[PDB]
Amino acid sequence: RNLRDLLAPWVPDAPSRALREMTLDSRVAAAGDLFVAVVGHQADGRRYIPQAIAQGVAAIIAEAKDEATDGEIREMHGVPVIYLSQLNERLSALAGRFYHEPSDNLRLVGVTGTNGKTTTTQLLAQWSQLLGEISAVMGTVGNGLLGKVIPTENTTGSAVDVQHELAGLVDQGATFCAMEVSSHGLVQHRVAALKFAASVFTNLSRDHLDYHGDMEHYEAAKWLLYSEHHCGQAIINADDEVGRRWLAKLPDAVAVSMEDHINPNCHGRWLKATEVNYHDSGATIRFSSSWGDGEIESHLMGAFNVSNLLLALATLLALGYPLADLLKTAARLQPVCGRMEVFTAPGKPTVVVDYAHTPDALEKALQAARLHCAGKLWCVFGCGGDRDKGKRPLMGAIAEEFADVAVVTDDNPRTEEPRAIINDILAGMLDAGHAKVMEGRAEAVTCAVMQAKENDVVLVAGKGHEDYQIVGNQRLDYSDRVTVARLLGVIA
Ligand SMILES: Cc1ccc(CN2CCS(=O)(=O)CC2)cc1
Ligand SMILES: Cc1ccc(CN2CCS(=O)(=O)CC2)cc1
Numbered sequence: 001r002n003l004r005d006l007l008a009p010w011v012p013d014a015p016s017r018a019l020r021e022m023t024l025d026s027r028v029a030a031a032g033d034l035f036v037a038v039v040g041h042q043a044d045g046r047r048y049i050p051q052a053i054a055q056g057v058a059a060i061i062a063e064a065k066d067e068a069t070d071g072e073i074r075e076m077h078g079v080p081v082i083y084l085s086q087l088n089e090r091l092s093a094l095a096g097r098f099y100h101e102p103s104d105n106l107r108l109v110g111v112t113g114t115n116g117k118t119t120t121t122q123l124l125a126q127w128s129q130l131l132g133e134i135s136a137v138m139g140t141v142g143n144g145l146l147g148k149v150i151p152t153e154n155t156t157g158s159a160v161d162v163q164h165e166l167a168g169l170v171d172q173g174a175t176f177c178a179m180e181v182s183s184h185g186l187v188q189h190r191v192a193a194l195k196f197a198a199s200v201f202t203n204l205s206r207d208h209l210d211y212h213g214d215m216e217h218y219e220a221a222k223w224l225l226y227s228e229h230h231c232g233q234a235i236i237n238a239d240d241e242v243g244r245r246w247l248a249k250l251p252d253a254v255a256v257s258m259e260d261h262i263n264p265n266c267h268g269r270w271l272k273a274t275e276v277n278y279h280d281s282g283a284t285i286r287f288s289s290s291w292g293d294g295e296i297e298s299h300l301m302g303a304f305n306v307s308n309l310l311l312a313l314a315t316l317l318a319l320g321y322p323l324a325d326l327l328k329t330a331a332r333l334q335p336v337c338g339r340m341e342v343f344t345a346p347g348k349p350t351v352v353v354d355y356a357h358t359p360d361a362l363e364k365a366l367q368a369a370r371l372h373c374a375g376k377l378w379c380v381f382g383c384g385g386d387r388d389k390g391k392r393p394l395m396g397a398i399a400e401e402f403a404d405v406a407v408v409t410d411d412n413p414r415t416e417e418p419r420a421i422i423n424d425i426l427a428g429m430l431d432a433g434h435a436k437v438m439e440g441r442a443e444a445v446t447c448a449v450m451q452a453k454e455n456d457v458v459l460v461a462g463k464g465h466e467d468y469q470i471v472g473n474q475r476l477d478y479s480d481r482v483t484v485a486r487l488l489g490v491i492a
Pocket of ligand 1: 157
């Protein structure tokens with residue numbers, strides 16, 4: 001890594017310096033590093049140029065605004081300081097070049113939208129890996145090779161971090177990466193120089209866009225951004241209103257629908273579910289497409305996961321993965337752990353474990369579960385103690401309305417009186433007397449599972465993958481998934 005070669009596309013006469021790492025943070029900037037001094041909200045990195053120099057950085061690249069002209073090479077204490085205009089806009093490209101263009105050394109698929117980003121990302125990574133790739137994910141659940149994702153707990157990734165982490169995955173042997181792209185990330189030019197093989201839009205609609213002008217400006221803002229990016233093949237959910245409008249303007253984009261929103265007259269590429277049977281262990285999805293027709297046995301639950309699966313299918317088809325091989329591997333696609341995760345056993349009720357711990361998520365989960373439920377829908381849940389109490393009666397009302405049997409139990413009561421939490425939940429119900437209350441979560445889960453009929457579905461909500469019950473100050477070892485598996489005579 002040489003400063004001269006790094007800047008060759010932009011600054012021809014740049015000094016030759018060996019460079020170690022690229023950083024925006026003067027605190028971590030060590031000897032031999034390239035320190036990049038940017039201007040943002042409140043913060044001006046050029047402030048810390050002397051500190052970085054004092055810490056022995058090999059070179060600096062700095063926002064030219066007000067202090068210099070574009071491409072201006074200065075020299076401070078023997079260290080090159082090269083100034084670039086609109087440095088925030090160019091940071092992705094700068095870092096891309098520094099890290100040897102990792103997006104040109106694997107197949108990068110970007111996924112954007114409000115809902116289904118995480119799931120669609122995981123399905124892309126899983127499915128590609130089943131077809132022989134070494135797949136990776138980047139997003140909110142974390143970054144890493146499939147099955148080895150390191151959480152992004154409390155770390156906002158800059159344009160440099162994005163390129164760095166992608167290069168990390170390349171180094172680890174990744175040939176495919178499914179990346180969640182946040183609305184904020186796109187606007188802040190954090191993926192500006194990435195060569196996306198495909199861009200997947202789970203939805204383009206947003207709230208607070210009722211005025212024609214606002215909708216107009218939103219669309220224009222986004223369309224502008226996408227015109228500046230290397231998006232590759234566009235795969236767009238046509239069940240979204242904005243999606244459809246965009247599809248009408250994008251003859252090379254792939255239209256994906258499960259609600260009959262494909263318009264055959266355009267002769268574009270398309271994929272649509274023609275019928276779905278939601279059964280006790282997943283969904284049988286019959287589909288037609290410009291690549292051919294087929295039938296997939298998905299082990300994911302609900303209509304939203306049909307959409308997500310179809311988006312991943314359409315994307316991989318667009319990228320040239322053979323339909324036959326995709327069909328042959330579809331049954332091996334699994335849910336994101338504790339996200340509408342189905343557990344079935346011969347002659348037992350179907351049990352779904354989901355993380356849903358808010359009123360909207362609980363409603364969505366129950367609505368999804370209902371589709372697969374020939375008999376009665378059971379809902380086993382509680383609410384966390386020592387947290388906001390407002391959701392409690394709302395979750396009670398939801399359980400009462402969207403389930404047939406509400407089983408109210410404990411869920412991390414912490415230091416709060418467990419029964420007090422339950423009372424708050426019951427308060428929200430029209431007929432609290434119709435709900436079952438059982439304390440001991442394990443006991444409540446058992447109650448539902450052992451009593452529920454063969455054709456019933458039991459939703460166990462609130463924890464998903466979170467393998468503990470916080471009672472008092474103890475993080476006691478407990479798992480909904482393990483409890484359910486044992487009750488069904490299967491393995492979690
Ligand atoms: C430290 C780190 C955190 C997160 C990411 C992932 N990246 C976030 C920004 S994004 O949404 O524009 C594209 C994905 C990378 C590195
Ligand atoms: C998903 C997406 C990708 C690109 C664009 C902008 N692009 C401008 C050049 S074009 O008219 O050839 C094709 C559209 C918008 C949306």
